[PDB]
Design a protein around this ligand. Structure first.
Ligand SMILES: *[C@@H]1O[C@H](CO)[C@@H](O[C@@H]2O[C@H](CO)[C@@H](O)[C@H](O[C@@H]3O[C@H](CO)[C@@H](O)[C@H](O)[C@@H]3O)[C@H]2NC(C)=O)[C@H](O)[C@H]1NC(C)=O
Ligand SMILES: *[C@@H]1O[C@H](CO)[C@@H](O[C@@H]2O[C@H](CO)[C@@H](O)[C@H](O)[C@H]2NC(C)=O)[C@H](O)[C@H]1NC(C)=O
Ligand SMILES: *[C@@H]1O[C@H](CO)[C@@H](O)[C@H](O)[C@H]1NC(C)=O
Ligand SMILES: *[C@@H]1O[C@H](CO)[C@@H](O)[C@H](O)[C@H]1NC(C)=O
Ligand SMILES: *[C@@H]1O[C@H](CO)[C@@H](O)[C@H](O)[C@H]1NC(C)=O
Ligand SMILES: *[C@@H]1O[C@H](CO)[C@@H](O)[C@H](O)[C@H]1NC(C)=O
Lengths: 190, 191
């Protein structure tokens, strides 16, 4: 038999992952073999679940640890395995600050910021906070980037000859990252 | 008649408290600070004696988002001159209302000024203007944070020409943000 279609692996907690698939079409009579397997440690479990149900909760997992998962259908006959799905369980700790922070392309009313995030901490978003560097500080701007794939952003409509303070936070299930230092940005008309 | 304490300041601490601080003082004894507070909305006035050698009273047993007028004096054998009125709202127990008078204007290819207005007495400490592209893609959005309720306008800058933005505008407060029933549309020009 062919493996389950529509296989999707999502982290629902710090110790649990949820594998879902599309309902299997029956003659008789079958079950779904699910194999999950840790990367950071040597830990494989193998679960049999009745064919008519559509998902399994994989539980008793460790925090911020990635697991590789595959599945199949057996009858009788041993079905061919699905492709390997991977996922991290949610973080137990606060996420690390984005590394390789590079401010460049500095213009009169714009600049480009680039960074790198470490995978493994369930970073769901990053925020780019920028404000005028003066001692007043009555307002700032948060650019909220909701997909952690994006590695770069261009700030726009900045004021010329102005010094800005720029910070970059990464947010996960626990909370935001804590920056030790900010970054400077000075525009030029010229 | 002695003059009142100097450097009088009234800070809202909680929903039921305000803190009145002043510059401490030290002829012959004894002396105490008479502090009066009174509700604007309700009819609730109280008179509090505190010994003259401490620097602050916490005026307690007040009601949520209620305005209060405060004054003070230094009494001895004779009663002193009253201070000027201090006024403050206690912190709110609800979310603030959405800002009315949302007038967008001066729309250019990369600029779009926005002005609003807020109702006082809700302890509104900041307002957030949010703006993203009209598309349903939840990739990016920009939260402009304005940390004083004094500021009434703001000019958006560096927007993309010929584009539709979905502007929201929240008001924040000791409980939480306001809840917009509706967003606002912003077209941009050529360029
Ligand atoms: C793992 O996977 C998903 C969530 O990530 C869960 O599937 C769902 O579970 C219940 C149904 O028992 C519901 O919350 C979801 O909707 C259900 O099916 C339809 C939805 O159209 C409704 O008519 C039902 O009333 C019912 O609510 C359901 N969602 C889907 C798409 O299947 C699953 O429970 C979760 N946990 C485990 C332990 O498997
Ligand atoms: C009322 O307000 C003032 C200022 O917030 C408080 O005075 C402070 O007291 C603590 C020590 O107990 C220190 O932070 C300083 O000595 C004071 N600060 C200043 C700025 O003077 C006061 O304690 C508050 N509460 C009461 C009940 O009086
Ligand atoms: C799967 O089959 C078993 C047979 O006992 C039944 O208990 C269960 O409700 C079935 N689930 C379905 C049809 O979703
Ligand atoms: C910024 O630098 C990169 C790499 O050279 C390139 O996109 C371009 O030269 C610059 N872009 C500007 C100034 O808009
Ligand atoms: C004020 O004087 C009284 C005298 O009973 C004393 O209890 C209190 O500690 C004094 N406060 C000071 C010196 O701050
Ligand atoms: C309109 O925008 C331009 C350029 O951004 C600015 O110079 C001008 O002051 C604005 N006009 C008003 C009436 O706000």
């Amino acid at each position: 038999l062919p493996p389950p279609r529509g296989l999707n692996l999502l982290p629902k907690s710090q110790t649990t992952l949820n594998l879902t698939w599309q309902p299997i079409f029956p003659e008789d009579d079958f079950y779904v073999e699910v194999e999950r397997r840790s990367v950071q440690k040597s830990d494989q479990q193998n679960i049999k679940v009745p064919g008519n149900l559509t998902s399994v909760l994989l539980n008793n997992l460790h925090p911020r640890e990635q697991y590789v998962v595959r599945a199949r259908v057996n009858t009788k006959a041993q079905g061919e395995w699905s492709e390997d799905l991977t996922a991290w369980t949610l973080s137990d700790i606060l996420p690390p600050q984005p590394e390789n922070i590079k401010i460049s392309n500095i213009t009169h009313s714009s600049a480009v910021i680039s960074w790198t995030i470490l995978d493994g901490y369930s970073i769901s978003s990053i925020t780019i906070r920028y404000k005028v560097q003066g001692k007043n500080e009555d307002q700032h701007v948060d650019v909220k980037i909701k997909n952690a794939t994006i590695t770069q952003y261009q700030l726009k409509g900045l004021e010329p000859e102005t010094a800005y303070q720029v910070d970059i936070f990464a947010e996960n299930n626990i909370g935001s990252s804590n920056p030790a230092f900010s970054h400077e940005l000075v525009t030029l008309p010229e």
